Structure formats: structure tokens, C-alpha cells
Amino acid sequence: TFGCTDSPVRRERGQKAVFCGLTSIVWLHRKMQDAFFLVVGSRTCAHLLQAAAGVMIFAEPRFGTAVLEEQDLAGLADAHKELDREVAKLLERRPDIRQLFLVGSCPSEVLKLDLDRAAERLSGLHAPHVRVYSYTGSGLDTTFTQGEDTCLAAMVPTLDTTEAAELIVVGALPDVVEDQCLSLLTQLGVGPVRMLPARRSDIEPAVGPNTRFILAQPFLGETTGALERRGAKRIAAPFPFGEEGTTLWLKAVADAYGVSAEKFEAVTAAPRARAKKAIAAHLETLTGKSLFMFPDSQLEIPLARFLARECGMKTTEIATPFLHKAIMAPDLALLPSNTALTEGQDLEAQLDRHEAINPDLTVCGLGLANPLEAKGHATKWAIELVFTPVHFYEQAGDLAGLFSRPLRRRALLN
Amino acid sequence: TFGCTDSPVRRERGQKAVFCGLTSIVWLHRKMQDAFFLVVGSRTCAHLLQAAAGVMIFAEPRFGTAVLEEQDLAGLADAHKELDREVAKLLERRPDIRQLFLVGSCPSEVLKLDLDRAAERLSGLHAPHVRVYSYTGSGLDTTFTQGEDTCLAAMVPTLDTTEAAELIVVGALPDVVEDQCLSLLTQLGVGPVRMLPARRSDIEPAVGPNTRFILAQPFLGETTGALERRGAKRIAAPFPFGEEGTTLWLKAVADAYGVSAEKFEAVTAAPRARAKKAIAAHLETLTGKSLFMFPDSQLEIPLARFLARECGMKTTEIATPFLHKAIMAPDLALLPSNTALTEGQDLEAQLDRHEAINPDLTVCGLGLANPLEAKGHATKWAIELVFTPVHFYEQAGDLAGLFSRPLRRRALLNG
Amino acid sequence: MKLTLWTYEGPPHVGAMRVATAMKDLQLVLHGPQGDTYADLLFTMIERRNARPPVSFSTFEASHMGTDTAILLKDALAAAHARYKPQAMAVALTCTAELLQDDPNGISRALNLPVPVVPLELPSYSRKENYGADETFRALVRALAVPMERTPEVTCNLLGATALGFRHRDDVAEVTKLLATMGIKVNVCAPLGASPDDLRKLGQAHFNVLMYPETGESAARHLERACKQPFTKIVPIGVGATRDFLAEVSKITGLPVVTDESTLRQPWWSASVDSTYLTGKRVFIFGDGTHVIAAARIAAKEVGFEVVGMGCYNREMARPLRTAAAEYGLEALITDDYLEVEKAIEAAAPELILGTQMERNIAKKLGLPCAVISAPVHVQDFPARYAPQMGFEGANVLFDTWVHPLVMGLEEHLLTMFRE
Amino acid sequence: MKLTLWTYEGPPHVGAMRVATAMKDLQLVLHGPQGDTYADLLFTMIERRNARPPVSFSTFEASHMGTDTAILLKDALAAAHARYKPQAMAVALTCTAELLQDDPNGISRALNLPVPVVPLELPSYSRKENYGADETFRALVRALAVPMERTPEVTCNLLGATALGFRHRDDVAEVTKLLATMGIKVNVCAPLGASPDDLRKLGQAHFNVLMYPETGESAARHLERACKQPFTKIVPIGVGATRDFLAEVSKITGLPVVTDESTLRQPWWSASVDSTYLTGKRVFIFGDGTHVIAAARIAAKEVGFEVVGMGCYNREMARPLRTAAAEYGLEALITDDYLEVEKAIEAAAPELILGTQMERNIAKKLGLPCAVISAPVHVQDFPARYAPQMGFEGANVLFDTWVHPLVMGLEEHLLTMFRED
Ligand code: SF4
């Protein structure tokens, strides 16, 4: 009734309606105060960032894109020198920047400019004030949130060495959510804990053989791999969505640090009851409703787990752009057994299955959403889930609220 | 060809398109930071104050009206009792008010509501913190700017007595203009000079048999009389509009105080040049153009004087709601002798004369402006002339600008 | 006496002017003091009019009171008639003249003009603007309309459009276009655009469209009894209200309801995904009765807001409003005191305010999104562009207009939240 | 490499999507990587469209490159034909695909489909969005239009209206009204609303109305050769330009100008006394060339502003704009760099700024009144209400829209001064 550990997942390729990893820059740079994200790409890449950022584009944000010209299409030597020109320009125009990310696009990769080598070279040149890194955010390599994965993974080799046994909570979270996490862990007797990424470049966590880390976001595969290469050990936990997920997440950490069942129950009691009361308000319109999820962010499985177990929703097809079998084990073990799981996407075929299922609520991209509304399907746009505070106790009702709203608007208007 | 001293003025009566004196509160209260203006009148009066104030109504202005209700119409024992409760309630809300004006309206006047007596009663009940005055701003008694006059007159008998020889400048002027006035008079060596009204209630001028006063505004007939009753003597001058108006006004002060020609000519030389330069940028458009002015504020004669002499305009009919001969003597002596002068109006008769004259530019109120523009007549709306800085040297080009603009717009918009 | 700063309505005589200016070839003569002409500003400035309002005042002042006031009225009446030769006239008292003993009806009849002069009774100390217009129009109609044979093809009158009406111009144009789609032509539209001779032709219409209860309800009731004409009870502001209106019109006439919806965009705009953040936004609604009731139904049932406060300034619409508000679980706020509005707004803590110009200003002070749905209203709300509140284009207009302030507010709030 | 935050235009292939999405019964297939479907959000969210754009991508990624990229393009052309049975199709390269070796023409010639498939050359590293749109429409018209028997009645085509066009929807409606008033019916309106079959029947129209040069001129020039149809060179934005337009149409057709002006209110509005304070007000105008040129004439000659700066981001329009600016004694600012715009604005200290959504934001930062006259634009400027820029209702709309922020600015300034400067 609740095991998806062994469910055979449909793997599909074909036409996709998903975002590339560049999109991740939009809400990543907000977290990392010292950082600047320079894409090397085409006008398309700049246009995407513009669309993805909305009004943030007018807020002098800490990203931009060196857009390729004819001259740059051949050949290497000259292009690299041209990149340095733009990077040197940028750095004096904004001197408070201490971290520069050279982000790879589809155009740059086909052109085979070695941004890894450019980062190396610029680091030597702008040392010690600016460290410069390189990772890929291209549509060739990466889907939406995976851009955060490649970014953090590119930082790990260079983090400070330490033998201390501190905790690292991995994944960019809204500051309000981060603080709550810190507070709960601190009052559990777990410390010190640091975040990756940190808010500033000078307070990035150290790693070493005694380090423990726990993921707050499901899309952190390469980052996990990188931290393990430095000797850090992962704490396995389902993802902190809703009352149950948050408790379970927190429980895995408390078990790892020897915290008693007595402490756990006492620190956690009030926030738990509070979370499950906020959720109850949404239990009316959600119980019994069928759920379909197009692939976007790799949040779909944890979210479907939360919606079924805590909100009484029935699952149908739950799709994800990438499924890390080990990282997703705890949540897969909690998903209802009927769930059809899909890794990847073949759009026309997946839209045929969707139509046949006729689900009550569909999570999908903005490009699908209105066209599906017009065909009489209640939708919920996915992208909101990656920027709105949704993890941990205090946000559990809001999260439920994100899925009940479109359903009560459909009822209200007809 | 200058001089309308002996010119027959038309004394005209009938339909009128003019504002009552209540309208004056709108820009008067801004000057007297310490005062509140309570109209005792109808919803009509409230509606007017709202319309004239436009946007200022949303900025918590220091005025308001006690709207008479049906119960207030049947018995005068109740109304004086209601007004007291309404005042005490108002003064508790606003402890910082030091001067209260009970302003008479047409409805309060017909009702025979004795606001003079109410002002005395309330003044007893709220001393020493708030002095309360009474005056009329009714349509029956008063046209537009005459509301300032009745206001200032009402507070003249209550002013401190003094034997000091000092100058009073009468008329509420915009703050920047007042400052310039003061500077110029100080530079000339004219010892302590006060405005009526002052910016605050506790620095109002004193009056005595050696006080001198000069009017910045032509509509100050009753105030003039009340200051003379207290013993003061008026300095006659044309009104300070434009380079010449302003020079003659300053000159009259200078001559009264024994200031030397050397000092006058040197204090005045550069601001005189400045103003002449700024007016000249408006001559091309204005010179040879014919002017018609409907009655509104009493500024029209001195403004017509400025427009003809300093802007080469041609006067046709210039009308004023009230023509005080002694106060207007200096300006009248400077007007082109062709000028047809009117005091009052029968609206329909005046529009018939207007249609015949076919004037290049017409000053009139918002009631007539668009209607006139629709018949092809270029208009400049009068009310702007009461509330824009227009007096003295520094505002002389801006004053002219107010008249060149409507004619320049007309030319831009149609070839 | 009530201490008054802001007033939502002028005196009834301004409403009379509002009916006279709306019409053509009719002169209104008001017995009043020099100074009361300030109301002409309203029609020439706000409505941007190309002529003087067909209004004149006896213009008594201090030096001509007593037995002179009666004469001035007579002069004014005779002068108006000799000059403009109207088809009819109306005579009334200003508030100040209401305290005099002059009989306008007696004076006007002794003058014995060759056209009807209709004397109006407008209690200036108990009643206000909207009553002034409603009563003036009723008196005009009672004097001029006569039972007549019904037109061969199905026609109706439009009732209650006036000068200084909030979007009356474009409402008239829009309602005409949607009756024309059902094959119904307009007989006369009145006051707005009508002459007294048009008023004489009211009776040949089959029924009346009552567009504004505040300015047309009395004339409609009279025309029902005198000319056996039914009138529509539903005001077509809102998609839902427009359908019910057309269903009502169908019941009246027997004609089927036909619609042209090719240009109706509000329902899809509201259904689209970019509108789902509007769900449950707390809206406070103030203004006149007709517009508040209409807006409430749109807010709740078409846009998905939660109506969190509801009221109006005009007593004549108190009961329809109290009846409306109860369906939302709300008690109606009935008041003409903007300070009371301000208390009810703070207590309700809305996210959006739909109101008059006063409400725009309350909303500025509090830093809240606001849009204007009702008079009183400054020059801005008399637009050069087509801007109905009624029918299908009105539904489109309302949607853009209410949503714009919300997007601006969120957009400004997001900008300040990522700078530092 | 140019360091870029804001871009006034997107890549040429979005221009192609603008033309495809405007149309019905055409599939556009683009060779591009997974991820470029983000542009679908523009047509679905902004234009609030109720269908997926008729646009699909070959969707290549890292694991399937090399000789697979040609296979993927082939599959997508085949799949799009089999599913939507279009009347015709277009195929083009994304910017990344332009770096690859695959030839869209030869791939689709080999597939040998039962409908025309039009290849598009779109230089994605040198040209932009508007060019993409202008080229795509040109190629589609070259492909489909033929010499034809003229219609008995005087008809015309509307040329240049697309998806994501600033007020295209209502401009089309208003132009149709003013032509109908002269007894001129529209034959086909393209791309917006047309099918490939509709495009075949272009030649039978007597003449062409070139509504937007940026996205229609190239097609108009072709139809002038092929079907001997001359095209209108005047864009009917503003009262005067509308009259100059109708006059122009008179010469082309021989028909007399008949107007309905019962609802034209802008001239009386600006002549009225309320507008007198508008005289001499300093305005800075920016946007695409068409809307900047039109807006400037309105500003100077219809509302009475002083035009204090003019420019456009649209390089294809550089010459007409430079020529037009000379008339106002201004040097035209030709730039795609918002920072240059910001400098020019600061150096001109205008009292009103007319422009793009970017100019809205520059203005707000400086606290200057501002109105939008040109794309790019956010959601609001795609309204449910009737909102043309053209013809007589356009003139009314333009008046309300430009003046409102000035009265807001004056109102705000007045009551901050009122309490208590
Ligand atoms: S999918 Fe590739 S080319 Fe398209 S925006 Fe993303 S990185 Fe740039």
C-alpha cells in the first residue's frame, strides 16, 4: 500500500518541455551575496535569463551573460582573451564581488571553449580578491535545478580541509527556512551546522573525513558525489516537506548525533502539531483528488509523497527529469504503491497518457499550463515550488495551500 | 496715449460668473499656519470648497464647514448651542490651532445667524489659547479675493497698539515672493517690516498713528479702511507686477522713508535687468496682441497695465468685480487711454461685447474657458493668477509666461 | 450641524444641473446667490464640454434682497427664454433661496411663457445630488410624457444617463450595441442626449432599460404606471449581470437572447493561470449602491476575491445594498463620512480597495492598491478613450483596471525586497 | 562578446515563433537543444494563449550528439507532420544548431513530405528577433504567393501583424474599421490569423497595408514585385498620420476618403484648457523605430510637448529614425544597450519618458513619469480591454495613456508639498 522501492520506472526521451540549468542562477545568486554568475552563451541564453528573472532583471542582479558574436565563433585563442577582457571589465565595475562563476551554455560547449581552463587562468590573475569557478548550466547537460547541482559540485574541490565533525546542510534555501532549520537543529543539541552554499564566500563550510552532510534538496547528485570524494558521509533522509518529511529528516540527523528520543519529542512536539493543523485547513478540497506531475525539478516525488500521505491525494503518473536511486530511496519507500513513475520525458506520448488519466490536478510548466486549462484540466505551475518557501514545519500549510488554491479557484469560478 | 484716470467706467449689474469669498480660504489658510477656517453654511458651500481646493482636500487642510441641517433652520437658541459644541469638538481634535475664523455664508446670513456675537462668546470660552474672529465670505457680500480682505479687516481692530514707525505689507503673498520683498526692503535700509497676515498668530503686526502700510494686492479696500481707523497711513503705489510695477512700488516705499536715489538705483539695478531680460523672451508672441479680461479677482487692471506697457499688448475691455478709485489711481494713470473699463457684469451682455471685439487673448474663469475655446477664442484661465507666484522682479518672466503659453500652444497645435 | 471636509455628493440643485446639462434645448433657472455658478466648472472642466451649461442664476446679492429677489427670478426666467428659445424650462431653488419666501411656481406661472416651465422641489438641507437628478428627471417626465401607441418594431428607452455620470457616455454606447444584437433599437435615451420633445415621445417604447437607479428610478416607476412600461431591475455591469439583464430583457419582450462574444476576454483572462494568485485577495468595496453591488458580484464570482467589506454613501440604495451584502456574510456600511470609511478599511485590512477618489487617497496613505469604480471622480476618470463599465467591453475594462494596481503593488514590493 | 543583462530583442528564431504562432495550420520545427522551449512561456503567459504554440524542437542533448542530431531533426519534422497534418511547415536553426553541420533544407527534401516545408536562414549571432520575424514571413510569402486575378471589389492585405506584437490584435481591428469606412474590405491579414492556404491568395488583393515595417516590409517588397501590389508607407499612429495614411490609400485606389469621427476625441482633449499645462513639457522617446517616429509627431504636433530625445533599439530602422530626428533638430540614439538609454535620459532631464518596459524601470528609479509605447512589454500591456495605438481610437487611447502619469506625478508632488514641504 505504501512501497515504491521496487516500482519499475518508465525511462523516456524525446520532445521535452523543461528548463535548462541556467534558470537556477535566478534564485541561486540571491542566496550567495558575494557571487556573480557570468554565462557564456548566445542571445537565447540572455533572453531565457530575462524571462526567468521577471522584475528581478531591473534590480541590478548579480548575473549576466557574455553573449557570443560572429568573431567569437572561431577560434579558441582569441575568444579566451576576449572573455578576459569582459571579466576584467566586470570585476572593476563591481569590486564587492569575491566569487565569479563562468557558466557553460549549449553554444559554448559545442564551440568547445574550455571554461574550466578560463576559471583557472582568471583565478591566477584576479587572486587573491576573486576566486573563479566553472560549471555547466547548458540544456545539453542539465535540467532546471541540476544547475544548482553542478554549481555546488564545482565549489567542493576547493573548500577548506578540516578534521572537525560538523554537519553540512546542502541546498540553497530561503533564509527564513534556513534559520528555522538552524534553530531546530541547535535546540536539538546538534552543532555546529553550516550551509552549502553559505550566504557569503568567506563563510563557506569546511570538509574532511569526519564531516557529515544531509541534503535538503533532492537534485544534489553530483554535489553528493563530490563531498563523498572529500571523505564526507551522507545522512539519508526523506525530504523535509510537510509534518512527516520534516520530522523524518530531523530524526535522521538526531539519530546520527545520538540525541535521545526524549529530546526529539520535546523540541519537535509544538512545531509538529502546529504544522499538521495548518495542513488540515486544506484537507477539505484535497482529499481524494487525483494528482499528475510533469517532470521539472526533481521535487515531484517528495512532493507527491507529501500530498498523498498528508493531504489524502491519489497519485497517477509522477514524472521527474532525473531519479537518483539512492538519494530518493527514503521517499520512494513512502510513496503509494500504485504510482506510475517516469524518469525523463517524451512530451506527445506523456500528454496522451495525461489525457487518458484525466487527473483532477496537474503540476506542469507555464508552457503547458494554460493550454491544459483550456482543455478543462486544473493545473498548478511547477516553477513556483522552487522559489517559494516550502520546506520544514512553518511552511507546510503554505505548501498544501499551493495545491489547494487552483482547485478552489476552479470551484469558485464555476 | 496712457491714462484712464478720467475714463468712464461701466457699472454693470446682472448675471454673474464669479466665485464667492469662501474661495479665498483655500490659499489663505496655507499662509496662516496657525489658523483654522470654519464656514458656517450649507452643503453648497462645502461642495465649493471641495471643488476649489481640488487635491488639497486630501491633505488635511485647516478649514471645514459646519453644514446647517434642517433642525438648525427652526430656532436660533439651538444653533448657537450647536456651533459651540462643534467648535469645542474641533479645538480638542486640533490643540495647535490658535486662531479660529467663523466665516459667514449666504445661508448663515439669510438665517440671521449672528456670527459676530458667536465669535465673542467662543473667544471668551477659549482664552487665552485661541482667539476667534468672524467675517463674511458669502456670495451676497463678497467676490473671490474680497474674502481675504474681509478676513484681514476682521483682525485689524484686535491687533496690538504701538507708536513705532514701521512698514506693513498687506496681502498674503507666496513664501518665496515675501522673502524677496523683505530682502529688497532690507537692502534699501527700510527698518523692521511685517506682513499682514503674518505666518503665525503670535507675530502679527502692531498698529499706531505712525505705522505705514502698502498693499501688495489690489483687493484690500476694507483692510485699508480698518488700518486707517487705527491711525496708519497708506503708501500709494501701482501694484508690483513686472519690472516697472515692482520698481514703482519699491520707489514709493523708498521715497516715503527718505532712502537716497543712489541707494535705490544700485539696490534695484540688477534685479531690474534680470526681469527685463526674462520678459523679452515673451515679446515676439505677445506684442501687438489684443487683450480682453473678464472680472474675477481685481488683479486685472494692474495686470492689463503690465501686459500693455511691458509686453506690448493692446487692451480692449478690462473688467473688475470692484474698482476702488484711490487704490487703483496709480495703475489707472498708466493704462492705455483706449481701455474700456468695467466694474461688475451682466454676463450675457459682456459675452456679446466680447464676441464683437474678437480679442486675441481672453482672461476668464473655468466656466467660460472651454466654451470660448470652442468658438475659436484663445483663453487664459484667471484663477491661476491668484495662486502662482507672480509679483516682484524674480517672477516677472513667469508672469508673462502665463499669457504667452496659451497663444503658443494655439500656434503649435494648428500650423 | 455636521463638521464637513469631504462630501461625496453636492446639493440637489447640482443634480438638477446634471439633468439639464445632459439634455438639449432645455433651460434650467436656479434661484440663488451670486457665487453659485462655481458648479459650471464641473461640467466644463471635468466633462471637458464645448458649451456653457444650459443653467443660469437669478444672482441675488446683499444690495438686492427683500422684494428684489422675486423680481430677479422673473428677470432670469424671461431672459433665459428670450435668448435661447428652449422647448421647455425648469425652475428651482438653491439652498440659500430655500430660506426665502419666493414661490418659483407662482412667479413662473404669472410670467405665462409660451413653453412649459417645470418647477422643481429639492430639499437642500435633507437631500443631496443624486436625489436632485432623480427628482428633476421624474418631474420633467411627469410633465412631458404621454400615453402613446407602441412603435411597430420592438424598442426601449434608456433611462438615467446624465451629465457628470461615471462612464455614462460609454455605458450608453455599449448597452445600445448589445440591445442591437438582440434586434432591439433605442427609442429615446434620457436625460443624456434628450430634448423635451424627445421626452414627449417616451410612451411609444415597449419597455425601459433602467441604467442608473440613483438618477432614473423615479422616472421609470412613473413610466410604468403612466405608459404601462416595464423596467429592467438588473444593471448590466459584470458578465454574469449582463446575461441576467439579457435574460430579463428576453422575458420582457419575448425575443430570444442573442450575443456577440467574439470580443469578451475577461472570463478567459480570469480563468488563466496568471490570475490564480488573485484567489482570496481581500477586497473592500465602497462608492454608490449600483456600482458597489455590481463590483461585489464580479470580485467574488468572476475574479475570485474575498469581499471583506462593502458599503455606499447614498441612502437611496441602502436596502438593495444591505440585501446584497448579506449574501457575502457582511453587514453593509452606510455612511457619507470618509473618516468612517477610513475606520472600516483599517479594521478590515484589505489587500485591494475598490472605491471613489476619496478611497484612492485613503489607499495612498495606507500604501494599498486601489482602483476607482464609482463617482465622485476628478478629470482623470472622464477619459478620451472608450471606457464603459457595462456589458462585455466593460467586463474587459474592469478586469484590466482592478488587476493593474495589484500587479503594480506586488511589483513595487518585490523590487524593494531585492536591492540590499 | 558583449556583456548583457537586458536585451530589447530575442534571437531570430523567436521571431520565427512569432510568425508561426500568429498563424493557423502551420507547424514550425526548430533544430535546437532541450531547454529552448522556455520561449513557449512568452506566447502562453504573456499573450495569454489557450493552445501550445505550433512549435517543436528536435531536443538534442549531450548523450545523443554527433550523427544523431540529423536523425532528431528528421524525427521531429515527421512527427509534427503526422500529428497536426498542417497545410505547410517551416524549419529553422536555433543558435546552437547554427554551430552544427546539419542542413535543414536537404534533410526535409529527403523526407519528401506531402506539404511544403520552408527552410529558413536565421543568423543567430548577427541578427535578432524582428529580423527573424521579417525573414520568416518573407520566405513563407515567397513560397506560397502567386500572380493572381484581382478581386472585383477593391480589397487589400494587412501585412506584418504577429504573435507577441505590441497591440497587434486591436491595431488590426481598428485599421479594418477605417478601411471598411472607405468601402475597402481586407483580403487576408498575415501573418496574424492566416493559414498557408490564406497566403496563396495574397495576390488577388489590389494593394498592401504595411502595418509594421519591422516584421512585414520584406514581404511587402516581394509582393510589389510578384503581384504588382504597392504598399502603404505610412503607419496610422496619431491623428495626422492616420489622415496621411487615408490620403495615401486614396491615391493608390482612386477612392475618396470617408472618415467617421463621431468618436475621435483626442483633438478636442488636447485643445481644451486642461491640456494647456502640457505645453513645452520635455519628452524623451524610445522603442522600436515605427512607434518612436509615430509617437514623436503626436508629442510635438498633436499634444504640444517638446521632443528632447529620440532613439530606437531596432537597427533595421536606423535610417528612417535618423531622418525623422533631424526634423526635430535631434540626433537619433541608435543603441541596444539600456545603459546608453539611461545616460541619454539623464543628460536630457525629460519630464516624461516614452518607451519600453525597460524605460518604465529607468523612469521609476529616477521618479519620472513614464508611459509605454513599444515592445518589449510585460503582461499588463497585453490587455483584455480594447487598446489600439492606431487610428482614431488609438489617438484617444494614446492621449489618456501619456497624460495619466503626468497628472499622477503632479498630484503626488502637490500633496507632498501640501503636507508639509
Ligand atoms: S537550452 Fe542552451 S542555448 Fe537554450 S538558453 Fe539554455 S544554455 Fe542557452
Ligand code: SF4
Ligand atoms: S455663493 Fe453663498 S451659498 Fe454659494 S457656496 Fe458661496 S457662501 Fe455658499
